[model samples]
Target chain A: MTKLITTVKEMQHIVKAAKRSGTTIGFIPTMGALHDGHLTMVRESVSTNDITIVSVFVNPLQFGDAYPRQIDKDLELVSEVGADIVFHPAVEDMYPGELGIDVKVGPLADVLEGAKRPGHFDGVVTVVNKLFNIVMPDYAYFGKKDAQQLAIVEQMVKDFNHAVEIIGIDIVREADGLAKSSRNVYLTEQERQEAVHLSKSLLLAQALYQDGERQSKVIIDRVTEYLESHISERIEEVAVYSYPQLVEQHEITGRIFISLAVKFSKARLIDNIIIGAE
Target chain B: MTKLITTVKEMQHIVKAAKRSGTTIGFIPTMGALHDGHLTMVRESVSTNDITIVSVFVNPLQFDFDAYPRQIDKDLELVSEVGADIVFHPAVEDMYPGELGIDVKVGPLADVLEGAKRPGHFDGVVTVVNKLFNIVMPDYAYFGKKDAQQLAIVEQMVKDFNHAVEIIGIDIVREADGLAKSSRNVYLTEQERQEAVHLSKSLLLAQALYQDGERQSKVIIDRVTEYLESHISERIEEVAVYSYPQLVEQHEITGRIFISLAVKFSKARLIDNIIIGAE
Candidate 1:
């Protein structure tokens, strides 16, 4: 039976108990709409440690005007997936008063999604820091599908000297190759089919890089043409970044992230594929 | 025997061992040059916690190139005398690389006083404290209330981060003449030392005004500035006075205010402050 805990105080209590009993705590932090993509992190956490806790917080700081929630079904999946604890806190419960400290991003956060969403990475950085404090986990898990997010978070842990070990799992994708994302639920049947092109374009860029294409503009140019012909109007930015910052580069080599975001009438969908060095 | 742990790995291991053994950890963070001021906080930690970890790391991010270095032997004497369980001294290896990907700020609280005079100063202030808090992860951390703005910002950081640590701001330790204890006071010659008394004198004037029921922030500041100008006319580098925020008092004063001044006396640059409590 999976125990559900709400509020930071309760979460800390369970963690304190686990710490004293010599149980290693593993954490999977999420906003409650649990897909198998999220389960990958939860399942990984369950296998790797004695106590696994999953936090389902749809952080208001991370999103804007539109907020989506699905707590009931999310709790059921986490329980079925073998998590020991599910921490689901209300926004007011998490943030009762004004937030006194602001976590500003460095140059690494200035590019990529950091540039697109403005204060987005800072939200992830701040909440993750708070969650790390509350959970006191030996290991924490995040999927590599959120490449820039994972990268920025890893940088944050290093920067702040947090002792938690951050493990980034591989991206989980649909059988059709579209990346698994919660926003996929918002797309209509036809829009859903069109969204597979999001992943296809990434594959095309990966294929181009595999065939010895070194120019960012060349790879992006082909992806631009491929995307423009499909859903270009909805596409905001098709960005490629280094491991940390999506800094401007003369040529592309080593570890890099290739990410893109496109709108599908009702919802905007983001997908990416990492081009690893080895 | 007091153990001196230097690296972050060793500090965390010891803290984890203490946590396992159920010993309460109290931390007093400081840069070297241990004075009466630092010892006061250390003493408080010694009384409260089972394990007192006094961290002395001269964070390169905070001070200048030729900043004063304490006699290592001398600093350890104070630590042993005060009964701190360990004096954690970290070198740059324990710190993050060249630039950090994150910067912690407390908005309005950061842009006043020392923050205004030194741009990008409070950004460093929150970072080192956050780093120390992350490293030590102690149950309680002590700081002096003399650095009112810094104490407030650190408290602000703890609140915002929701860190599971109690922030204890110790009252300012003062000399008989009312001058606050600081490392820079060592540079002052006899006459220069005589001039240093003006900072506390203005602080006392503000303290007196608060007792007389002068609640107007404007009135208190104007008079304190007048008192400083008339007395330390040449030696003063900068003087600042502001009623600390009471929740969100937009345009007014609180029952308490912080009064401070700096002096550029030929050999020394000394800074000092006092907090006037009304109620």
Candidate 2:
């Protein structure tokens, strides 16, 4: 039983009906062109909750301004994976006019991808905030590949006091170790082969942490050196930061992630791994 | 009939359970120096919904920050008396655990009149109200029109954020002598109190002027300012007219308009406004 919904009103009505019937909803919000990373989130939602809702709107706000829209294939994929409903709304249906209020991000959105693409995360939370209100899910799932996005959305749930819980799923990766992403298609075949080094570099950082290298600069230096040697020298940012909180770390202590960005000919790919499990 | 909840978690849990059992909740968010205005809102909520929640937080974000009055014991008694079912009185730390990583802002709506007088006031307001609505998860949230700008801004937040709660604007509660009931009214001196009655009277005069074919915004603004200056020794902060809800400045009044004025008397700044024209 998979249903595709195209309006906010219909989606909201179904969600409210589901809630009144005492069923828990699991939501996975995506911008359509479905990938393995998105499917992993949908699978998680399907296994855990009574209802799984996958929203596929290429949020205009987050783009700063593809986007790629394969809603037809996206529908088939989500239905096969056990998502109960797919909410695909038009841009106008989502935003009828200019926003009456602006949802701004602070220091959390000021760094990493947010720093690279200004107002990127602000655009993220704006549309995500709108979707959360529309879906009102019990548990909303997000892939941790966009690690900063996960952290920012988590912070938003906490700060805005939205009752819905945010569950961050692990990054789904390729067979050769490249992290899954929509932009991966833009990679030239040579760049695709070289992109494996992005994740390989994070593993090197992880291995360093396992062997008791707590210095952030040492881990960052090693990862940067590895990427420059193996991949294109056009590495964007290779830094270590406190996981979810996203502050630059001087020396790693509690949970931390070593994230890296590498620019392929037409694609830019980002990857990271969280450490200190115990 | 009234349960006093001090934690956000407990309040949310209670609200969720109530919602699960198919109960409609009405919310009134207040700063806790309970007055007839607050009670009137609670009464409306009580009559309309299965559960009525009144939150008594002197939200520091909206405070100047609160040189604000707090009488929790009396607040609870009044809320319970007025038939509200729950009083969510969380400590400041519970609501705002840390510096927010995300902040919500109002645009041009917050750049005029009361917003100009008190910067970040509506931002603080929508922020806290957004949090409270999430916690209480109300079916209807009541706001008094005495703080007309707040009500309008809040209504906009609901529409923009897509929060399910319906915002119900109650008529301004007033003292017999024509002063609007306010939590800050306690700060008024005896003579200032006597003079404060003219605040609402001036808006009434503005209303009468509007009724008598005064279509020019400057005429209404000047008449209200002059009337207040003659009646009260206090300095008038602002007297302006803006289109209702949209809050755009109006030179020649057309469509629905709000004529608002602010007067600073001793310790408190009092404001009053009347919305005129067709809805």
Candidate 3:
């Protein structure tokens, strides 16, 4: 049976009662356009925790005016995903007063994804913080698809001394080699076919690095050449960052992340693959 | 039976369980030097609610270089007199991670009295507020009228959207000779004790103006000057207008507050007062 929670008071009471009964709560906070990526998080939460709570609020604070209609449709799909309990609180309920304090997730927030979109990580951290406080879970889960988000959240938890243990799950992908994303549904039929090239560039970069191309400049150039040649109309940015610390390096180390963002005539898309020392 | 909560984890667990059982909690947050004033707040909490939680923490963030030692001693005493179930958490552990962002409280209405003397009064306010949140389960809480700093806190709760509980406060008690009962009373001596009477005298001047049917600033100031001149000493600083909520003709509506302070030869400071209004 699925239960829907829409108030902070009710959620607090539920979590309190759960704690009283000594039940471990596993929480998954999402914007709620459920895909296989979301399912993977939920399935893991349910399997590991005594009670699983899935929050499906389309956080407007996180999304800019760039994509409003897409965010709305994603929320609709998230409610259909079966979970133990779904908390979808309104904006007023979440933020009763004016949010005066800015919760900034430092250095990690200023690189990669954050560098591309200013105030993006601020919104993410703020909403996630409110969710963490409201849920008060024993364990919380996030997918590695948003690696920067995961890293920043981990830093926030450590810096704030929040008691909840954060678990980062592996990224789930589509059979067509595309990363599973709610935004992926926004692509046109032709764009969908061309979107595979973004993932293909990452695969080719990994192949070149494994074949002994150590220089990051060479790897970025090779990936850039392939995307420019194969999917010229769909490519936006193709960059390779060192692994473990997702920093820009002159040479590939033990592991590295190949990330790229492609914008078609329809929608913007992002894809990444982590290449490890085999 | 008194249960001592030393850790934040344990305190949260207990409060969470108490909430689940549908118990109404009454909280009395104190620094821990148990006194009669502190007892008054605790007694009210115990009588009014099902579960009374009294927290004794000498919040370091609340104290400055000058007031730290005395405040620490006072906190210890206040906690002992707080005869309810005490959750004694340490200051270091309570502020474990250190506040990342600044917590501020603004009062365009009630920003006089003690607020004038202490520039960082609201800093003390937000720190204690966090402590109160940690120890108390959601419900009603009680505070005393001895400190005007606390009344500012009550107003802040209402204005800041911290609708966590019903904050109930009581009247300030006094000695037979009209001396306001305070923990700071221990610092006063014979000469300073008599001089401290000027604090109350200034309020009486305002009171006398209402009695004489004189409702202008000129009349109020004349009376206040007369009173201050009689009891003014070398230690006395400026005895200016401490509070004036609304200025109107006919009768001055003096709320529950007094213009009061005392300074000693040995660097001791004491404050006393009585709130006057035409009832």
Per-residue C-alpha lDDT of model 2 across residues B61-137, encoded as one tens digit per residue: 86566477878889999899989888999999999999999999888788766556888878899999999888888
TM-score of chain B of 3: 0.67
lDDT of 3 by residue, A8-93 (tens): 88987778667656688999988765666777888788878888888877676777633233434444444355456888787778
Model 2 chain A worst lDDT window (10 residues): A60-69
- lDDT per residue (tens digit) for residues A1-278 in model 2: 68899998888777876776678999999888887778899999999999899999888777643477788899999888988899999989988887878898898877766678889888889988889888989999987767788888989999999989888898877788787777999998888888888888888888998899898999889988888898764988887888767788798777787777777777678888888853
Runs of candidate 2 exceeding 4 Å displacement: A176-178, A181-213, A217-238, A261-270, B64-67, B175-240, B251-254, B261-272, B276-278
User: Which candidate gets the maximum DockQ versus the true structure?
Assistant: 2
Best by TM-score: 2
Distance from true position, residue B79, model 1, in Å?
A: 1.1
TM-score of each: 0.75, 0.83, 0.60
* Native contacts kept, each candidate: 0.77, 0.81, 0.01
Best by lDDT: 2
TM-score of decoy 2: 0.83
Query: What's the residue-level lDDT of A25 in candidate 2?
Result: 90
- On a 0 to 100 scale, what is the lDDT of residue A100 in model 1? 68
Q: What fraction of the reference structure's interface contacts does model 1 contain?
A: 0.77
Q: A59-122, model 1: which lDDT tens digit per residue?
A: 8787753656877788889889899988987778778788867887777676644667788887
